[PDB]
């Protein structure tokens, strides 16, 4: 199981400065030495590289665009198969009811339970009712990952109105909730943990120096 | 580093019914599936078996009796060398002021820091002054393991006077404190965590069916 505490997302997509399975493995080692209790990683190759540097539990995803689908976080059984091969402790996937390229959410959950019975599953959701649906499907973890990053939640951010969306998710499900998306400061991390999330995923604020640099530069431009 | 939460001690000495590297590896798997954040294990053979079964961090010891010494938890460099080979994340040793068979406590600490710099060390102590001495030697974790199990702490037990000893250890050192020794109920586990220990080690109450059986039988004999 994932402990209580800080999960560090070690991701760099193509054309990002730190894009490299090797570099993400070193970012994961840094997070481990810093006192992270887990890693979130993208693609089989990054996950396998990370598993050579740290023994921390890994939340695995495959970000891959499909034609005629807005679902890109572990969209089909192809991505699930890669993550089963990766041996990541948790498989995370988009858990919205948006049109998928192949299998439905229900079919992907069943597929993982059948072919990988020792792996836990995490629902990346954008709405309270998506979180409720994920809890009903028996997801081990429910993340706020896609809140503000779907066409129907545009302009919304996790921290808005003292984390009201997170408070609503926590009240609606008894499953372990993960604060993920726009946790950019230790103060924000403390708040979501005090509100009663199981753990919190921090990415950009630790592993995206471009994003951190922009925050420093922006204070002078206000 | 060790997360916050429950560490399960999976030990069975030669005289015990479950004495087996294989059985202790399955006890460790059971602990992992139950939501343990770490394992405490005894001997290289048990540790290697556990570390091929689960990726949980392992606190390694070697219990071995020596002539003309009351120190038996990782007594000499021989035991330290076995634990270095085991690749356990944390090396625990008796951190009492008691004379050791070969190297002193101070010598063994220096030995581990030199020969295994990526390994954390845990002090099994009996007294507040031993906890303070462990902090002086730069121990990563300080456990209450030997409190009541030395010639100079006879009649003392961790839970006595609402864990007064644990309270005294916690306010004496800034290092991460581990509640270990006679933590035998969830109620005790909750209490020591509420008092602000980093984590707690539970052994016999989970992994010694003989000791659990005795507690069931004893309620009818009072
Ligand atoms: Cl970056
Ligand atoms: Cl037993």
Which ligand is nearest to the Cα of residue B204, counting in written order?
2
Report the distance separating Cα B16 and Cα B177, nearest Å: 29
- Put simply, the chain A residues between 53 and 72 with a CB less than 8 A from any chain B CB are 55, 57
Is some CB atom of chain A closer than 8 A to the CB atom of B1?
yes
A-chain CB neighbours of B3 within 8 Å are 3-5, 37
Report the distance separating Cα A106 and Cα A97, nearest Å: 10
Which ligand is nearest to the Cα of residue B12, counting in written order?
2
Q: Which residues contact A169 (CB under 8 A, 6 or more apart)?
A: A125, A128, A131, A142, A144, A177
Is some CB atom of chain B closer than 8 A to the CB atom of A4?
yes
Report the distance separating Cα A138 and Cα A142, nearest Å: 10
**Phi, psi of A90, deg, nearest 5:** -130, 130
Burial of A216 (0-12, 13-18, 19+ CB in 10 A): exposed
Is some CB atom of chain A closer than 8 A to the CB atom of B117?
no
Report the distance separating Cα B191 and Cα B197, nearest Å: 10
H helix and E strand count, chain B: 9, 8
Question: How far is the alpha carbon of A143 from chain B, nearest alpha carbon, in Å?
Answer: 19
H/E stretch holding B6 = strand B5-9
Is some CB atom of chain A closer than 8 A to the CB atom of B37?
yes
- A1:B55 CB<8 A: no
The sign one gets for the Cα dihedral A158, A162, A167, A168 is: negative
Report the distance separating Cα B123 and Cα B61, nearest Å: 11
Q: Which residue of B has its CA nearest to A119?
A: B33
Residue A69's nearest CA partner among A95, A101, A93 is A101
Residue with tokens 């939460």: B5
Decide: B79 and B62 in contact? Cβ < 8 Å. yes
Report the distance separating Cα B93 and Cα B116, nearest Å: 15
Nearest CB to B4; choose among A4, A32, A55: A4
Residues whose Cβ atom is located within 5 A of ion ligand 1: A 17, 208-210
Q: Which residues contact B33 (CB under 8 A, 6 or more apart)?
A: none
- B3:A4 CB<8 A: yes
Decide: A36 and A207 in contact? Cβ < 8 Å. no
Report the distance separating Cα A170 and Cα A13, nearest Å: 31
Q: Return the SS3 of A170.
A: helix
CA distance to B28, B44, B130, B165, per residue, from B110 (Å): 30, 21, 17, 28
Report the distance separating Cα A47 and Cα A25, nearest Å: 8
Token couple for A149 = 């990053």
Decide: B59 and B90 in contact? Cβ < 8 Å. yes
Phi-psi region of A181 (alpha: psi -120 to 50; beta: other; left: phi over 0): left
Token couple for A204 = 């950009």
Burial of B139 (0-12, 13-18, 19+ CB in 10 A): buried
Decide: B86 and B60 in contact? Cβ < 8 Å. yes
Residues whose Cβ atom is located within 5 A of ion ligand 2: B 17, 208-210
Residue A183's nearest CA partner among A164, A210, A204 is A204
Three-state secondary structure readout of A19-61? CCHHHHHHHHHHHHHHCCCEEEEECHHHHHHHHHHCCCCEEEE
Question: How far is the alpha carbon of A72 from chain B, nearest alpha carbon, in Å?
Answer: 29
Which residues does residue A40 pair with via DSSP β-bridges, in sequence order?
A9, A59
Report the distance separating Cα B128 and Cα B144, nearest Å: 9
Which residues does residue B90 pair with via DSSP β-bridges, in sequence order?
B59, B120
Residue A88's nearest CA partner among A10, A26, A197, A12 is A10
Give me the torsion for CA of A158, A162, A163, A168, rounded to 10°: -140
Report the distance separating Cα B31 and Cα B29, nearest Å: 5
Q: Return the SS3 of A114.
A: helix
Report the distance separating Cα A158 and Cα A170, nearest Å: 13
Q: Return the SS3 of B213.
A: helix
Residue ranges per domain, chain A? 1-222
Report the distance separating Cα B127 and Cα B130, nearest Å: 5
B-chain CB neighbours of A1 within 8 Å are 32, 35
Reported residue count of chain B is: 222
What distance in angstroms lies between residue A127's CA and the mean position of ligand 2's atoms? 49
Nearest CB to A35; choose among B1, B5, B89: B1
Is some CB atom of chain A closer than 8 A to the CB atom of B29?
no
Residue B8's nearest CA partner among B64, B58, B55, B53 is B58
Token couple for B97 = 């002021």
Decide: A125 and A147 in contact? Cβ < 8 Å. yes
The sign one gets for the Cα dihedral B134, B139, B142, B143 is: negative
Q: Which residues contact A174 (CB under 8 A, 6 or more apart)?
A: A135
Decide: A158 and A182 in contact? Cβ < 8 Å. yes
Give me the torsion for CA of A163, A166, A167, A171, rounded to 10°: 180
């Amino acid at each position: 199981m994932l402990p209580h505490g800080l999960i560090v997302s070690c991701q760099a997509l193509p054309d990002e400065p730190l894009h490299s399975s090797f570099i993400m493995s070193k970012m994961a080692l840094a997070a481990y030495e810093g006192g992270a209790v887990g890693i979130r990683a993208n693609t089989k190759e990054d996950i396998l590289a990370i598993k050579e540097t740290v023994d921390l539990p890994v939340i695995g995803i495959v970000k891959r665009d499909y034609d005629h689908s807005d679902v890109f976080i572990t969209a089909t059984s192809k991505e699930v198969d890669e993550l089963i091969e990766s041996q990541c402790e948790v498989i995370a996937l988009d858990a919205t009811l948006q049109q998928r390229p192949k299998e439905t959410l229900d079919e992907l959950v069943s597929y993982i339970r059948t072919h990988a019975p020792n792996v836990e599953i995490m629902a990346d959701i954008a709405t309270v009712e998506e979180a409720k649906n994920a809890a009903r499907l028996g997801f081990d973890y429910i993340g706020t990952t896609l809140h503000g990053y779907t066409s129907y939640t545009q302009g919304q951010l996790l921290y808005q109105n003292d984390f009201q969306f997170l408070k609503d998710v926590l009240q609606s499900v008894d499953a372990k909730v993960i604060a993920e998306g726009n946790v950019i400061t230790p103060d924000m991390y403390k708040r979501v943990m005090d509100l009663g999330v199981h753990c919190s995923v921090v990415g950009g604020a630790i592993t995206r120096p471009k994003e951190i640099t922009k925050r420093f530069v922006q204070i002078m431009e206000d």
